[PDB]
Curated annotation (Swiss-Prot):
<protein>
    <recommendedName>
        <fullName>E3 ubiquitin-protein ligase RNF31</fullName>
    </recommendedName>
</protein>
<feature type="domain" description="PUB">
    <location>
        <begin position="70"/>
        <end position="141"/>
    </location>
</feature>
<comment type="subunit">
    <text>Component of the LUBAC complex (linear ubiquitin chain assembly complex) which consists of SHARPIN, RBCK1 and RNF31. LUBAC has a MW of approximately 600 kDa suggesting a heteromultimeric assembly of its subunits. Associates with the TNF-R1 signaling complex (TNF-RSC) in a stimulation-dependent manner. Interacts (via the PUB domain) with OTULIN (via the PIM motif); the interaction is direct. Interacts (via the PUB domain) with VCP (via the PIM motif). Interacts (via the PUB domain) with SPATA2 (via the PIM motif); interaction is direct and bridges RNF31 and CYLD.</text>
</comment>
<comment type="function">
    <text>E3 ubiquitin-protein ligase component of the LUBAC complex which conjugates linear ('Met-1'-linked) polyubiquitin chains to substrates and plays a key role in NF-kappa-B activation and regulation of inflammation. LUBAC conjugates linear polyubiquitin to IKBKG and RIPK1 and is involved in activation of the canonical NF-kappa-B and the JNK signaling pathways. Linear ubiquitination mediated by the LUBAC complex interferes with TNF-induced cell death and thereby prevents inflammation.</text>
</comment>
<comment type="similarity">
    <text>Belongs to the RBR family.</text>
</comment>
<comment type="subunit">
    <text>(Microbial infection) Interacts with S.flexneri E3 ubiquitin-protein ligases IpaH1.4 and IpaH2.5, leading to its ubiquitination.</text>
</comment>
Length: 182
């Protein structure tokens, strides 16, 4: 991980976050994400907003095929919350998220630290049955939301590829989990 290796990564990371701001419903290809996937950087360096190591530590229980799927699905839902905040057609009820929502209960509530990601978006204040933005806040911090969404999108992409045995840096992640995803 040289200085020119850390430079290429920061740059693509800032650009991809900008891509989300322009089109929130936009889908990202594997080739589009690879500069952030195939980098030889420390885990704590790739995920600055997201605590990837803690997500693994608190959720890696049982078979890899199980908790990686539980994790990907949860991250997928969390990603959508972010995409919605950046969307031109944003729900009028965007200021809050309810934990007893059918999708949330079956996805995000299954993973430890799902609520922690929501606060990164801006859902910092405690509302009944969930989290919400402060009352005085007019709009989401689009740059903050774009940054978090990208990392959430990133981590899900890595976990998905692990299951597929197609990750460009597969060995490093299997050493993190200390188990092979068959």
């Amino acid at each position: 991980p040289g200085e020119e290796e850390e430079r290429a990564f920061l740059v693509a990371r800032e650009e991809l976050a900008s891509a989300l701001r322009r089109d929130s419903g936009q889908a990202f290809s594997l080739e589009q994400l690879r500069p952030l996937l195939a980098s030889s950087l420390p885990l704590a360096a790739r995920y600055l907003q997201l605590d990837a190591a803690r997500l693994v530590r608190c959720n890696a229980h049982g078979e890899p095929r199980n908790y990686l799927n539980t994790l990907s699905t949860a991250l997928n839902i969390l990603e959508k919350y972010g995409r919605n905040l950046l969307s031109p057609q944003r729900p009028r009820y965007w200021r809050g998220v309810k934990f007893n929502n059918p999708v949330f209960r079956s996805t995000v509530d299954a993973v430890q630290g799902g609520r922690d990601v929501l606060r990164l978006y801006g859902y910092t204040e405690e509302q009944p049955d969930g989290l919400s933005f402060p009352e005085g806040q007019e709009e989401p911090d689009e740059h903050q939301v774009a940054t978090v969404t990208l990392e959430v999108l990133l981590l899900r992409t890595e976990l998905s590829l692990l299951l597929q045995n197609t990750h460009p840096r597969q060995q490093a992640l299997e050493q993190l989990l200390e188990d092979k995803v068959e």
